[PDB]
Specification:
- This is part of a larger assembly, with 8 protein chains of 8 kinds.
- By secondary structure, chain F is mainly α.
- Chain F has 4 helices and no strands.
- Chain F is elongated, with a radius of gyration of 18 Å.
- The termini of chain H are far apart.
- Classes of the chains: A mainly alpha, B alpha+beta, C alpha+beta, D mainly alpha, E alpha+beta, F mainly alpha, G alpha+beta, H mainly alpha.
- Chains E and G meet through loops of E and strand 2 and helix 1 of G.
- Chain A binds one RNA strand through helix 2.
- Chain D: This is Small ribosomal subunit protein uS7 domain-containing protein.
RNA sequence: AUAGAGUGGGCUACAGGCGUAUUACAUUGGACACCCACAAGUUGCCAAAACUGUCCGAAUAUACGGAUUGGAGUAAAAAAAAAAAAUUUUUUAAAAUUUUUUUUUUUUUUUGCUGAAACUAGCCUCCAUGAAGAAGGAAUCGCGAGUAAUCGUAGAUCAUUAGCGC
């Protein structure tokens, strides 16, 4: 597995090798989290748990920055056929929520899908409201899964975060109950502008 | 203007067919066509072939004689009939 | 109920007329109206811990999405010191962003006035009164002066 | 206590200064406040601004003829933030970094009783004392 | 089952006001129970007199005849509008209305009239058979109003169809 | 991100970089010379070096002034046909 | 890259199929022949042809 | 030209970003 | 003939000089996305500056600016029906599909535009060449609140031409 990782890292003029090594790691980690192949020389000892965390998920769904020349026109008249997220290989392989390979029938058989059979690669993605390239701000998902909204910074933890900013020197001073309620009503749960207003 | 009908030269063509009594372009490659051709309008385009033709173009005060050669084939004839603002 | 004429004509070079009142409705929910531009707005105030604050359907922090404009929304509410306990239901029309903010601020002020008489100005007693919020009841009905029927001429 | 908001808002409006969003200048001046924090604890911000502006108050104005005139202190604030900002554009166009750094370093130096704002400031103080 | 809408256009508010009042007199006369003895009246709460604002447009002019590009002046057209609402169930009084507005001439004032109404529809028996519910009232006729000697008492009259 | 070539304009610049594979957010201090050989080969697949084109347009408007045509005497005169400071001659 | 929602175009004619969601009603209008009754004939034929679906 | 030819801004100056409605 | 037509110019020429405007000389900015943000403006629906994200700061004349000049008028996306079906791509072990390959279909845009004719002398779109210009002396003008400036927007005459005019 470090075999394949060092196979990928070795060269920078045959890229197909590198990306294929990457997704080989992806499926092998999915297989290891499945518990399909236990080694014959290993102890009775539980395998390391596979967690995939994906910040800003829907960049795997918006159009990319890479484009191509279309085959029709001359290069002189070159409008850009911009390449899409499904047209990449690696991010298409990184579509874990739409992947079947966390819902492994091998892990549905050997772990049984039971509460004692925790044998699936637990995968979590979060995506933002500020895409740097035009991704949809919602995810129309065909594959069943559980969605959890992140609630905003409620009043108590805004007061606590302001106290922490009063600790770290970002602030000059403590906040009133009035100004804490004011900031809670102001940023609406936006963390980054709550950080921005901290001197005020 | 190539789209939907690219060429307009009707009165020039009437004079060209008047020239075309023995050869439009020296079919009898070119020999200067000594009979003068004197148009009365310069909005006309120039059609491929039409070489070695003595064209007399109007400037608003006279008729300007210019021999056509191979380069001026994709042009409109009014480009060769100026108002002479030299200085 | 006995309401009266509250309106003003404060501006210079162009007048104004917000003939709309603020009043409490029998649902326990007061309604009020406010414009400070020709762009205009209305409010509807429920004492509640429900959805909180709302203009134009959406939660406020994405619609208005400059922070300074957000405290221009909250400024009569922050001046009141009665922030949390009311559901804020409101509608707006027209204009540009912080004009909508200060308009919806005036409307929220009016609804808060009929909720509590002494904080802000009203027409309950002859169209006069004084609280901290009585200053921003009467709207600032200045509009743009008209683009001059005449010349640059320079 | 509200004079903090007054001086800051006059700083904002004078920082607007060409036609644009006062949102643009407002985020610019708040960036100057945070850059003042960063350079100040690098090598305590409303504090240093209030000290800088109270260091910069021209109490008696003079009118040329030379005649001194008493001045309502809100225009003292208003001239004050003005002289700060034209000195800021002097330094920043000489640096031609952003403006936020330039207004930050100028609010530090006018806090430290130093800089061309302080120079102009106390010469017109003494020249108000001259021509009585 | 007939619905009538009368729209009215004017320049002086005096004339469109008199026009609105006199046609209101005509409607209330036209469905008036003048005597009790027959007793299907339509003062249903559809009925209105909706007033309307206008189309704000300013059209300015040079004051001077020649050079005079300083010399501007603003000018302006006004159109004042009302709509008159009623509906009824028998046609003979509707014809009394249309002949009433045929007689009384009104000065400077346009009459545009909308007459959505029910009218029965023949079908070829094939589509009735292959039927075997929504509104679908879609005729919306259209007529010209100018260039043939008419100063615009035009009547437009969309139709509503019924074939269950 | 070759927004940086000089003998060509910008759209063809990002075209040639895309035609050998250089995306945005790459600097000239980050291209290995194999790709330089590739992009040069693609330059003689494209058209080359706008001074070669400036020689080319020199015989192009030489052709136009060889036609006894008034745009030819524009180009020997410097008059706008739509700053006689620059000319194509 | 901007266009009005109400195209309200011209240089053409049609039967103008449209629906009104406010009152749950479809709307078709007349435009081809000069007289109103000829248009009533055309749209009545269009209504019959509409029911062939 | 305020970026008249190639922008998402100067083409509202040249009246093209507003695509011309089909009329005659 | 100081009268009318007809055809084509000219009314727009170009050492100099002057008046009026616009656009910049950047970073408070350029670009690109965003939601395609909210208007004047529903009467008988539609923006931009900005806000949020990302790229850029070498006297580079910068990825600022956009004048002159050549050249060319070109791409597709959507999805339907049948036959078959479990194939394409690397290194020395892997990868993308369970949809690959055939026939019929089919929309919606696309077409340089408008005019009879766009060389002078229109306008549009896209390439390419990328000028001066790094804030302007003497001198001086205009204007103190929704004002200057900046930003669009829509109306006129108009076949189209207003980008800057009003």
């Amino acid at each position: 597995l470090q075999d394949v990782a060092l196979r990928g890292l070795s060269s920078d003029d045959n890229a197909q090798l590198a990306v294929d090594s990457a997704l080989q790691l992806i499926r092998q980690l999915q297989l290891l989290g499945s518990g399909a192949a236990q080694p014959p020389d290993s102890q009775p000892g539980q395998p390391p748990r596979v967690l995939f965390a994906l910040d800003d998920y829907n960049y795997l769904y918006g159009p990319t920055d890479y484009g191509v020349q279309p085959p029709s026109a001359s290069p002189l008249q070159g409008r850009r056929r911009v390449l899409d997220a499904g047209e990449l290989i690696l991010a298409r392989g990184l579509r874990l929520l739409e992947s079947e390979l966390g819902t492994n029938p091998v892990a549905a058989a050997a772990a049984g899908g039971g509460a004692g059979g925790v044998g699936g690669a637990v995968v979590v993605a979060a995506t933002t409201a500020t895409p740097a390239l035009p991704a949809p701000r919602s995810l129309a998902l065909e594959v069943p899964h559980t969605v959890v909204e992140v609630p905003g910074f409620d009043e108590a933890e805004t007061a606590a975060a302001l106290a922490h900013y009063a600790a770290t020197g970002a602030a000059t001073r403590a906040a009133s109950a009035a100004e804490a309620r004011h900031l809670f009503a102001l940023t609406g749960g936006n963390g980054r502008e709550l950080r921005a207003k901290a001197g005020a | 203007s190539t789209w939907k009908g690219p060429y307009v030269a009707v009165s020039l063509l009437q004079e060209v067919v008047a020239l075309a009594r023995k050869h439009p372009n020296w079919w009898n490659i070119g020999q200067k066509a000594p009979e003068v051709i004197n148009t009365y309008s310069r909005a006309s385009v120039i059609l491929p072939d039409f070489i070695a033709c003595r064209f007399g173009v109007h400037n608003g005060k006279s008729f300007v004689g210019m021999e056509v050669q191979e380069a001026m084939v994709g042009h409109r004839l009014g480009e060769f009939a100026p108002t002479k603002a030299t200085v | 109920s006995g309401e009266a004429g509250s309106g003003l004509a404060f501006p210079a070079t162009s007048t104004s007329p917000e003939p709309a009142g603020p009043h409490i409705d029998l649902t326990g929910v007061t309604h009020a109206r406010g414009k400070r531009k020709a762009s205009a707005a209305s409010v509807q105030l429920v004492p509640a811990g429900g959805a909180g604050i709302t203009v134009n359907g959406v939660p406020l922090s994405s619609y208005f999405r400059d922070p300074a404009c957000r405290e221009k929304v909250l400024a009569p509410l922050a001046l009141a010191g009665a922030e949390t306990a009311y559901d804020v239901a409101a509608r707006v029309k027209g204009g540009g962003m912080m004009g909508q903010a200060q308009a919806i601020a005036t409307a929220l002020a009016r609804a808060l006035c009929v909720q509590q008489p002494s904080l802000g100005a009203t027409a309950g007693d002859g169209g006069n009164g004084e609280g901290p919020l009585a200053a921003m009841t009467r709207w600032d009905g200045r509009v743009v002066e008209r683009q001059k029927p005449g010349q640059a001429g320079s | 206590x509200x004079x903090x908001x007054x001086x800051x808002x006059x700083x904002x409006x004078x920082x607007x200064x060409x036609x644009x969003x006062x949102x643009x200048x407002x985020x610019x001046x708040x960036x100057x406040x945070x850059x003042x924090x960063x350079x100040x604890x690098x090598x305590d911000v409303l504090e240093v601004l209030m000290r800088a502006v109270d260091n910069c108050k021209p109490l008696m104005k003079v009118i040329q003829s030379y005649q001194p005139r008493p001045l309502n202190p809100d225009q003292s604030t208003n001239f004050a933030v003005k002289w700060i900002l034209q000195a800021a554009q002097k330094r920043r166009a000489g640096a031609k970094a952003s403006m936020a750094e330039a207004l930050a370093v100028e609010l530090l130096l006018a806090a430290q009783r130093k800089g061309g704002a302080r120079a102009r400031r106390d010469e017109v103080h003494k020249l108000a004392l001259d021509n009585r | 089952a007939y619905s009538v809408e009368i729209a009215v256009q004017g320049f002086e508010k005096r004339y469109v006001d008199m026009a609105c009042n006199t046609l209101g007199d005509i409607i209330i006369l036209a469905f008036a129970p003048k005597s009790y003895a027959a007793l299907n009246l339509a003062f249903g709460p559809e009925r209105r007199d909706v007033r309307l604002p206008w189309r704000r447009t300013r059209i300015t002019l040079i004051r001077g005849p020649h050079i005079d590009k300083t010399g501007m002046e603003q000018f302006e057209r006004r159109e004042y509008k009302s709509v008159l609402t009623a509906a009824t169930n028998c046609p003979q009084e509707l014809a009394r209305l249309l002949e009433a507005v045929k007689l009384y001439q009104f000065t400077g004032v346009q009459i545009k009239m909308q007459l959505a109404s029910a009218q029965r529809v023949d079908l070829p028996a094939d589509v009735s058979a292959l039927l075997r519910x929504x509104x679908x009232x879609x005729x919306x006729x259209x007529x010209x109003x100018x260039x043939x000697x008419x100063x615009x008492x035009x009547x437009x009259x969309x139709x509503x169809x019924x074939x269950x | 991100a070759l927004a940086r070539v000089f003998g060509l304009g910008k759209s063809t610049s990002l075209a040639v970089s895309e035609a050998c594979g250089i995306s945005k957010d790459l600097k000239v201090k980050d291209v290995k010379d194999s790709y330089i050989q590739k992009v040069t080969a693609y330059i003689e697949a494209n058209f080359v070096t706008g001074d070669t084109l400036k020689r080319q347009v020199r015989e192009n408007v030489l052709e136009e002034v060889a036609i006894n045509s008034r745009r030819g005497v524009r180009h020997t005169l410097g008059l706008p046909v739509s700053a006689r400071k620059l000319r194509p001659l | 890259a901007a266009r009005a929602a109400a195209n309200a175009a011209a240089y053409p004619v049609d039967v103008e199929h449209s629906f009104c969601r406010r009152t749950r009603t479809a709307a078709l209008s007349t435009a081809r022949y000069g007289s109103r009754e000829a248009n009533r004939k055309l749209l009545l034929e269009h209504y019959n042809e509409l029911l062939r679906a | 030209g305020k970026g008249d030819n190639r922008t998402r801004r100067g083409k509202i100056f040249r009246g093209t970003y507003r695509e011309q409605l089909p009329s005659h």
